[model samples]
Target: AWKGEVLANNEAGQVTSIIYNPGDVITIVAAGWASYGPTQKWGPQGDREHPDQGLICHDAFCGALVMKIGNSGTIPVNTGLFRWVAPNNVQGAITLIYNDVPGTYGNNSGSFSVNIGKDQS
Candidate 1:
């Protein structure tokens, strides 16, 4: 599981949808309040390997990549590639370090949403 802060004061539910195989799309959505940011961060914490960086959320149909933010809004619809290497089972969790804090915003609550799936197109 991913455990982190939202850096905000509002409440919203993040959605993470995953498509494993052809015609087998599964989605997992997680919602959280500012108080619940310390215990939940990510799901299916396994030793999954993602080259270059970490697991990435992609578009549901066109096989493009989409990026989500914690306590923010969805980015414009753009096409790209993203990959996240699973942390070793010994760790079993991926830590997403956030930037642009302690400078402009004082809200220490934030949230994240992601989508996982295969690109068979």
Candidate 2:
């Protein structure tokens, strides 16, 4: 459970580093400004089946993704990535997720840490 903020525009997309863990649940909460909100998605969809949850982000117009939660797979826990796409219609400091593990939420300026839990299944 960790949180952070990101600022992206129509021209640029951002992707965080890799987080490795057997059972990892990363949540993303964001608020868009100007247009609607932000657009986001996940990465490293290797050979394993895709997780049930989808990527979330705050967008323009009506703040599309508001403090939403997403589920990811860590079978190998070797290669997983985080990505965010801000609509061409919005811009601002949108809240996002980083190494969210269990209980931690901090602002972009704050310090949030993540701890990997035991493997499930």
Candidate 3:
């Protein structure tokens, strides 16, 4: 199991102690709120269902919690629970990011406390 918080002010997000193994079954749960601005608050699910050009993760909603394994691409991890299997080419460390626009979140606040587990679905 792994636990930590992803802070909105961090553009690069957080790198957890968890490691990813190819084909490993993984589960994640992230809770709490993240604010991409002084007054803009969001849950891990962010503010909308569609993407916004202003968001750093342009494919995802603004202020969402996202994850990336090693050098792999990122995927959204919202609504408090998420599940996936490590891809065959996926390996190495784990990193989390807060979806925010460029030149943004500098005045943000709050965090998403996350828990990760292997084969715990």
Candidate 4:
């Protein structure tokens, strides 16, 4: 479990990097600042809808993908839970970007990191 905060005006803030075992239940708790609302997307790449740019392919099969869309806002308090299962015997990282609103430029975009560990069994 980790606790983080979003920047003022809804920009990204407080990046957390941690290691977890395979099949681990990683919980991320975030709070939005005043005047803070986020339009978020998750995948292998930065683009939200384009799966071809954000999906990991394992030979002829799809290895991993974004299971949930973390899009919501009102006043404060938002949470995201990811049950990460290793796609293969490789270790890597992924990032989450938050924009001020959907279909916007880099005016108010922020990002964080999640480093995934290889299965050690």
lDDT of each: 0.26, 0.25, 0.80, 0.30
Structural similarity to truth (TM-score) of each candidate: 0.20, 0.23, 0.86, 0.31
Task: State the lDDT of candidate 3 residue by residue for 52-117, as single tens digits.
Answer: 867756656888888778988776777544458765788878888898887776887999999888
Candidate ordering by TM-score (highest first): 3, 4, 2, 1
Off by over 4 Å in 4: 7-15, 33-78, 82-94, 99-105, 109-121
The TM-score of candidate 4 is 0.31
Q: Which number leads on TM-score?
A: 3
Mind giving the per-residue lDDT tens digits that candidate 1 earns over 1-121?
A: 2222322322222232321222332222223322112332222221122222221322121111222433322221122223332222212111222222123223424433333344333
Q: Candidate 1 has what TM-score?
A: 0.20
- Per model, state how many residue pairs clash: 17, 13, 1, 0
Which of the numbered candidates is closest to the native, going by highest lDDT?
3
What stretches of model 3 exceed 4 Å from their correct place?
Answer: 49-51, 80-83
Task: Please list all clashing residue pairs in model 3, or write none if there are none.
Answer: 56-100
How large is the C-alpha RMSD of every model relative to the true structure? 14.2, 15.8, 2.2, 11.3
Q: Summarize candidate 2's per-residue lDDT along 45-119 as a digit string, tens digits.
A: 211232223323212111121221123221121122233332233332222232221221221122112222222
User: Roughly what TM-score does model 3 have, to 2 decimal places?
Assistant: 0.86
